[PDB]
Amino acid sequence: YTRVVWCAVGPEEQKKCQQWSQQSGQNVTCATASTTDDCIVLVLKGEADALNLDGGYIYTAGKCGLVPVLAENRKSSKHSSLDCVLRPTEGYLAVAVVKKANEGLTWNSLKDKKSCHTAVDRTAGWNIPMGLIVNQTGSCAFDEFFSQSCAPGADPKSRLCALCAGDDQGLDKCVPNSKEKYYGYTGAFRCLAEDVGDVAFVKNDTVWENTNGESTADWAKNLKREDFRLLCLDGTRKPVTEAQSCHLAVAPNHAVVSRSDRAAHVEQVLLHQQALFGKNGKNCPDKFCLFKSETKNLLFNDNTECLAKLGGRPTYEEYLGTEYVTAIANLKKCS
Amino acid sequence: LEACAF
Numbered sequence A: 001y002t003r004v005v006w007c008a009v010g011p012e013e014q015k016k017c018q019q020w021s022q023q024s025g026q027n028v029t030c031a032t033a034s035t036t037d038d039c040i041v042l043v044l045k046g047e048a049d050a051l052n053l054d055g056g057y058i059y060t061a062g063k064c065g066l067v068p069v070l071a072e073n074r075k076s077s078k079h080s081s082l083d084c085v086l087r088p089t090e091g092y093l094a095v096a097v098v099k100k101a102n103e104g105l106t107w108n109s110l111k112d113k114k115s116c117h118t119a120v121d122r123t124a125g126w127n128i129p130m131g132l133i134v135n136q137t138g139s140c141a142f143d144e145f146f147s148q149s150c151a152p153g154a155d156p157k158s159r160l161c162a163l164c165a166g167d168d169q170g171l172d173k174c175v176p177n178s179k180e181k182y183y184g185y186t187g188a189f190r191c192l193a194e195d196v197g198d199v200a201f202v203k204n205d206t207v208w209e210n211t212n213g214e215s216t217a218d219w220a221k222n223l224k225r226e227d228f229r230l231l232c233l234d235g236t237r238k239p240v241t242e243a244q245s246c247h248l249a250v251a252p253n254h255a256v257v258s259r260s261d262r263a264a265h266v267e268q269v270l271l272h273q274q275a276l277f278g279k280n281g282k283n284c285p286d287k288f289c290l291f292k293s294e295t296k297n298l299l300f301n302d303n304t305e306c307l308a309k310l311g312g313r314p315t316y317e318e319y320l321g322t323e324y325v326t327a328i329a330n331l332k333k334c335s
Numbered sequence B: 001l002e003a004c005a006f
């Protein structure tokens, strides 16, 4: 009775999910939607059981009564003795990244520049930087701050979508799924790399995983970390090796959500599925790897080591943290 | 300050 229906966002996640379904012996099956918000609705209607969400989308799903189930956990440091599945998660660093050759651009001179965002409503790509900006400017007019941007999920004819590129046919401009060339951590960092935008709002890991030979994808195979700088909130610029003293925020790890009535069955199936297909799973790399997708972060981030159990059966508010929830709430007063 | 957007 634990057949779990996963929700895939867009056609590339659907194909990966179908491969997972086949390998799992239909213990997992797939439903697909065009946007994360649409996948959330399938879950609320009981037509899907679950999916993995960024923290800004956990806020949306949690105000509708979905609950967190397990969290992505990446490479640690402290607490190294514990199993991954039992390790406390530590959040990721939200950063603002520019080209080093774009000299004299700082946090304080971002007005009228071009921006690259993972998607509207995501933590590092949107909630953190636009929340800071609205606050700093004393103005809700966040869609008139940058001259042009790519922020998937915005109005396709607005300046907030002017920089997005759509799929290789040129269709689906500014849609919030992987078919949009500049969607997600990797799409927004590509948007900066090709110099479509002046600044990209991503996380620290994205910079490292797509530079210095860590990616062999054509747009990234030849990028060097030294060609990039982080923008710090005190007006200074630093090397990407200094993210710990030059970030915008610490963000809560992406996590799986489901209906409260399905949480327990979803949790058990996932724990067993990752034993088979997770990082050292017994059929990965042989048959299927749940946490790989050629750096495209499909279903899970490709840097995921395991999905970890949560401490204290937290509410979505306790998971996200009171201060982040309040920042989101404040930013949403604007629109 | 609270309501499901759907």
Ligand SMILES: *[C@@H]1O[C@H](CO)[C@@H](O[C@@H]2O[C@H](CO)[C@@H](O)[C@H](O)[C@H]2NC(C)=O)[C@H](O)[C@H]1NC(C)=O
Pocket: A075, A076, A077, A093, A204, A205, A206, A208, A209, A214, A242, A243, A244
């Ligand atoms: C920012 O992200 C990078 C990439 O994830 C972090 O570097 C990794 O850290 C682990 C262990 O600390 C190393 O074993 C990996 O080899 C690193 N990846 C690469 C490609 O170097 C980096 O530590 C992060 N910075 C901060 C301050 O969190």
Ligand SMILES: *[C@@H]1O[C@H](CO)[C@@H](O[C@@H]2O[C@H](CO)[C@@H](O)[C@H](O)[C@H]2NC(C)=O)[C@H](O)[C@H]1NC(C)=O
Pocket: A127, A128, A131, A132, A135, A322, A323, A324, A326, A327, A330
């Ligand atoms: C933008 O400004 C608001 C208003 O100051 C910040 O909200 C305060 O957040 C602190 C820390 O959580 C709380 O002690 C206050 O209760 C909040 N004030 C109000 C009126 O809600 C908010 O954090 C700011 N946003 C960001 C992203 O920094």
Ligand SMILES: *[C@@H]1O[C@H](CO)[C@@H](O)[C@H](O)[C@H]1NC(C)=O
Pocket: A023, A024, A025, A027, A276
């Ligand atoms: C499917 O789930 C059943 C019952 O939980 C389990 O016995 C079986 O090993 C699973 N098969 C795969 C390949 O996931």
Ligand SMILES: OCCC[C@H](O)CO
Pocket: A317, A318, A320, A321, A322, A323, A324
């Ligand atoms: O992320 C640490 C939790 C603190 C939170 O802001 C309070 O719920």
Ligand SMILES: [Fe+3]
Pocket: A054, A055, A122, A123, A124, A251, A254
């Ligand atoms: Fe995120």
Ligand SMILES: [Zn+2]
Pocket: A247, A249, A250
């Ligand atoms: Zn900090």
Ligand SMILES: [Zn+2]
Pocket: A312, A313, A314, A315, A318
């Ligand atoms: Zn609690």
